[PDB]
Subunit: 433 residues, 2 copies
């Protein structure tokens, strides 16, 4: 197993990673910004290295600084975490060219899924369901244009008030009208009220891949996830098998290695590929609760060249989990609201999981994002899970800053949310956004 690793990220995730390393007997190097001196994981790592000033561009984004840190400490691999350089193909290539192991997929692969086109194209071949439409451009002949629309199913759009065709009568006009807007067009199937269901995978690089059920991330605000849960309500074992197996196959055909996620749009029992995150996600714990798999350790094994420990048959969905992201932000602008936390109290109990680096007297800096933690409650059913969350949030205390707690509470209390199956627009809708 791996000797030492560099945790190339900060906050929450960093801490998550550290714990996982410790458990595995792996030495930790913590790279930090002068401003992240007081971070919890930093305080807990084995080695430490301040890579640069406060600003991300000069610290967390500084490849060179990062690489060298690895050279000096004599670290073998690097863990990108999520959101920084996690999906930056250079870094990846660079790390490897440098003599270190990149905890994630091949740069090649990253480049591939980096552009919709190739991604989609790759997806198509692999049998991954994508949004139907017109292969090439859309011509003059109304007979076949309309045959297309039948094929794909109204409503559809043709890619000024924006316009959605709901039937034949309108087809021709909207089509022409758009061509007129130049002085070369296409038709795409319309997804009015879809849900956001993403599939979780693991691949060893040696031919093995596995799906680990799904997650519903429909509760979003400004295209940013707020609540996440697993498994996805409404999803059947059969529907789960179908898209999971398609997903794994793809993985195989693409030489995927590590953890990855496939994000789909789900409407009327159908899936439509949106994108692949070629890294672990913030929402992973939701899945860990349900399968009992530790995504992070598994990621560490793969990197070491261990193949997949798990077989699909050993993967089992049990119970239900919900996650509430917790942020320090402006209730109106949604911007981070930096400051010193005067009082903190975490919630506890059965089925309660707290993932945060914050602490009492800890100062939230303005240079980064606003997320300060995540709360995951598990339960034998959805309902139990929701109930735990209700309480947990009630027990949670964070003074000295503006949070998001109130809204989460309000969401847990939502009629429809408790009913389940809301869509990607419900949230903004209920807020007035």
């Amino acid at each position: 197993m791996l000797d030492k690793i560099v945790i190339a990220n900060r906050g929450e995730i960093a801490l998550r990673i550290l714990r996982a390393c410790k458990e595995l007997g792996i030495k930790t190097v913590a790279v930090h910004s002068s401003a992240d001196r007081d971070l919890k994981h930093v305080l807990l790592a084995d080695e430490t290295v301040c890579i640069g000033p406060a600003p991300s561009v000069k610290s967390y984004l500084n490849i060179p600084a990062i690489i060298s840190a690895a050279e000096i400490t004599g670290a073998v691999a690097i863990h990108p975490g999520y959101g920084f350089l996690s999906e930056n193909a250079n870094f990846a290539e660079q790390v490897e060219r440098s003599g270190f192991i990149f905890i994630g997929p091949k740069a090649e692969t990253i480049r591939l899924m980096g552009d919709k086109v190739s991604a989609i194209a790759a997806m198509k071949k692999a049998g991954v369901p994508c949004v139907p439409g017109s292969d090439g451009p859309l011509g003059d002949d109304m007979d076949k244009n309309r045959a297309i629309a039948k094929r794909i199913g109204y409503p559809v759009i043709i890619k000024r008030g924006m316009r959605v065709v709901r039937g034949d009568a309108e087809l021709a006009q909207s089509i022409s009208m758009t061509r007129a807007e130049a002085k070369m067009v296409y038709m795409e199937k319309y997804l009015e009220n879809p849900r956001h269901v993403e599939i979780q995978v693991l691949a060893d690089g040696q031919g093995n891949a596995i799906y680990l059920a799904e997650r519903d991330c429909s509760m979003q605000r400004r295209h940013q996830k707020v609540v996440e849960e697993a498994p996805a309500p409404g999803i059947t074992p059969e529907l789960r098998r179908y898209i999971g197996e398609r997903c794994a196959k793809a993985c195989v055909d693409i030489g995927y290695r590590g953890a990855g996620t496939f994000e789909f749009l789900f409407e009327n029992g159908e899936f439509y590929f949106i994108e692949m995150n070629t890294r672990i996600q913030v929402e992973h714990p939701v899945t860990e609760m349900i399968t009992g798999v530790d995504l992070i350790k598994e990621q560490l094994r793969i990197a070491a060249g261990q193949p997949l420990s798990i077989k699909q048959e050993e993967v089992h969905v049990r119970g239900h989990a919900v996650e509430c992201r917790i942020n320090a932000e402006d209730p109106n602008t949604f911007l981070p609201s930096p400051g010193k936390i005067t009082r903190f109290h975490a919630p506890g109990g059965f089925g309660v999981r707290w993932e945060s680096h914050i602490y009492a007297g800890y100062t939230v800096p303005p240079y980064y994002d606003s997320m300060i933690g995540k709360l995951i409650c598990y339960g034998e059913n959805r309902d139990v899970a929701i109930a735990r969350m209700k309480n947990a949030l009630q027990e949670l205390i964070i003074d000295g800053i503006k949070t998001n707690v109130d809204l989460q509470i309000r969401i847990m209390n939502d009629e429809n949310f408790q009913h389940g199956g809301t869509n990607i627009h419900y949230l903004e809708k209920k807020l007035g956004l």
Copy 2:
């Protein structure tokens, strides 16, 4: 479910019960002493009631006061919790008679099991493995029993063979019983509804003790096979029936050489119960409430599956080198977090641990696929735990987790005292 309930307890176990109420939609009533005003669960309760000055004698033990509290609030039931009036027949008797619901078994049952003798007797009726003995000047017969018992034996002096028989008996003379030199402390968890249903929830090992007080607990118990698991469980479940047990309870046994010897039954929820919830996924507390509301047993034996392994380190405010209670003000606190980590405690930064009550302030529970994972989580977990302003057990717990012998599993009730050098 029940509407409103009284939490006839405090600290840690009080907050665990509160949370279970909330989830169910049950209103809570918290009775506290003037010295537990600031308790966590107290701050979280629906309703509150001061029942007396600090000394438990006057507060937590003040029956009449407790009873009145349920009256004025309109409460329906009372949850005794653990270690107070929890195993008090009178209390149970008066509760019921005053028209309330006692969340526990029947007073009759509490007495019946509160007697070292009466119990054994009952246990022998149900057919529960008890410690073999004389069962009631001869050196001829007297030797044959011992054969039946198996050596070693003890006259209540230790005997290993016929030889030392006389000499030892003659010194004794100046009852014979089985001698368990190196046993483990294995207890079985049960749930019964009083409506004829009874289920066992595997076992736990609490061999790790000091002054006969549990320090670390785990589940399941290492070396314990399904076959054995079943044998004993079925046995304990059966007895629940004969005795008409209602509620949660535990049968504690001494384990040695593949054999179990009954010791006792705590007619109540135990401290260590969490270790079981993790391994079977059953909320022991909610069931309790359930049974008290007149519902039947929700689970079926076949539905009881043991998965993974769990460990529990009790956290106390004592001097680790003297074991002297350590009341004081916690000035810095940080709880551990993560996957498979469970923190159960009412303490909070700025909180004052009083001298009046017991020294335990929290429990730390870790889970894994393996016992190795759980121990490994424990270790990290303890590393993250921060409690400043008072003396704690931490460091000792850390030492235990690192004990080569603990990592191996199978230790006995004596290891700890030894390891520490307290046996002297």
